Design a protein around this ligand. Structure first.
Ligand SMILES: [Pt+2]
Ligand SMILES: [Pt+2]
Ligand SMILES: [Pt+2]
Ligand SMILES: [Pt+2]
Ligand SMILES: [Pt+2]
Ligand SMILES: [Pt+2]
Ligand SMILES: [Pt+2]
Ligand SMILES: [Pt+2]
Ligand SMILES: [Pt+2]
Ligand SMILES: [Pt+2]
Ligand SMILES: [Pt+2]
Lengths: 168, 156, 165, 156
């Protein structure tokens, strides 16, 4: 039903925390985009399980893209994941990808430490163009403030915004 | 202490309601644009300014646009010699409601306000974009209502 | 065929000059939005609003030319566009929506505060406005200038204006 | 003295055509995204041109991974003056795509503006060009002209 595509870190990370507030209680598909060390910028995304991820995403009506804001954009893992949709749109193993994605609802959770409420707007507008291209309805988002793990818990505005993320 | 600069039409409209949610318990001064000099005199006396405007064509109301545009005259008015200095120490907020996916399509307007405030040296402390079509509709926008109620809180 | 909606100050104005170049040679319908008593010292007048609509409705290409005031369009252009809400339900112009949905739109905006960057929100606001109307946003020019004649120094803008249509 | 940081590949494609129009006559260094070696080469140039095809209304994945790594460089003891060195450089952006890029690529330009501002680098200019298939960029006369004059400080 609901999938959370996490392009941040895991266990404690501000991205994980905010996402849990948004999907609390649901039996949501939790996707974590893998990355291997070569810490921000110290990794390289791993996409060995990309097809498995697409398979899971296709079964979900609601998609929540959760990401830290790196250099005023999304994470390296989420950027390489979305860029690969270009390949999937030409993939015979997922012949109805465009149509299937077009009926889904999308949400975004992004956390940054440099006045995200303002400096994170270009990223939200970028997501707007991405979803519009796919015909996906961009239903809502949350911009949260945080630098180190767990500091999002101090952004009460973001915590309550995430809890009220899913439209009703 | 707090001034709500109302750019719509005083009539229990969605923008008015959302701004009231933000200032509940603060006993703010409500300035309805829709007497320019008196308005300027009144806002200069407030530390916090909340610009509340319905969203028209992905921007502010024509009333609020004519109001801010006239600041160009005030920046050179000898009766208000310290206008820019006084404004720069104020904290500004924006509350805007519209019926066409405003939380997403109203972002350019938020960026314009960011530039206006930065130009004046004012701190842009927060904003809330809300969704509504007919009066009262905003009371169903849980996310917006929650955000407005927390707008001016120092610790919640 | 082509219409230039000018929301600035005429003759010699940076906005007038760039628009002039964009439609140089063409027999374009020149629409100037009225205003009477310098920035912020006027009040737009729309007594001729209906005749202006009648004219743009006959043009396939619409060029919106405006100075950048407070990071937005001019007061006259803002009040003009805002009124489209009334026109969209006006018995006098039964087909406004459909007629506008087939026109091509362009924007020429001039500002004195690093417009190539600070004028982007305005261009994005125009993108939403045109998309709402079904109008194709074909291109734009962001010129730098604050005083009459200044736009003659922005050769990059004059070029663009020339290569706009 | 100047470097073109290409986030595409060496292929003589639309982004490369536009970038070349800008550095013609400058004998610029062409870097096609040896990370440490690349950082050393760019640190020696006072003008940096970031050239990238537009993917999903953003930069290429290759350029994204490169700029993201600056976070590591900002804390790398082997490059103790990285931030300071970059701050005195002039940055330009050349970006080409086939989905109404001059309009839909604006958020990307704003991101670059934030990236450069964070580094203290002067964002001197940019060109968004239209091109769907190889060679299409030659039809975008506005972009070709803008790229031609991008680094010029004289006219005719
Ligand atoms: Pt994080
Ligand atoms: Pt469903
Ligand atoms: Pt990473
Ligand atoms: Pt106060
Ligand atoms: Pt405005
Ligand atoms: Pt002018
Ligand atoms: Pt035509
Ligand atoms: Pt005016
Ligand atoms: Pt040089
Ligand atoms: Pt290309
Ligand atoms: Pt990017």
């Amino acid at each position: 039903k609901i999938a959370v595509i996490n392009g941040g870190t895991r266990s404690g990370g501000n991205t994980d925390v905010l996402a849990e507030k948004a999907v609390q209680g649901f039996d949501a598909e939790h996707i974590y985009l893998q990355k291997y060390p070569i810490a921000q910028g110290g990794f390289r995304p791993v996409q060995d399980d990309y097809d498995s991820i697409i398979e899971r995403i296709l079964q979900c009506h609601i998609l929540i893209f959760a990401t830290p804001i790196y250099w005023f954009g999304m994470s390296g893992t989420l950027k390489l994941f979305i860029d690969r949709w270009s390949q999937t749109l030409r993939d015979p193993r997922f012949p109805d990808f465009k149509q299937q994605m077009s009926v889904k609802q999308a949400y975004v959770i992004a956390v940054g430490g440099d006045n995200p409420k303002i400096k994170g707007l270009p990223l939200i507008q970028q997501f707007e163009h991405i979803f519009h291209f796919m015909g996906m309805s961009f239903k809502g988002y949350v911009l949260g403030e945080g630098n180190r793990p767990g500091d999002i818990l101090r952004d009460h505005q973001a915590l309550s915004a995430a809890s009220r993320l899913l439209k009703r």
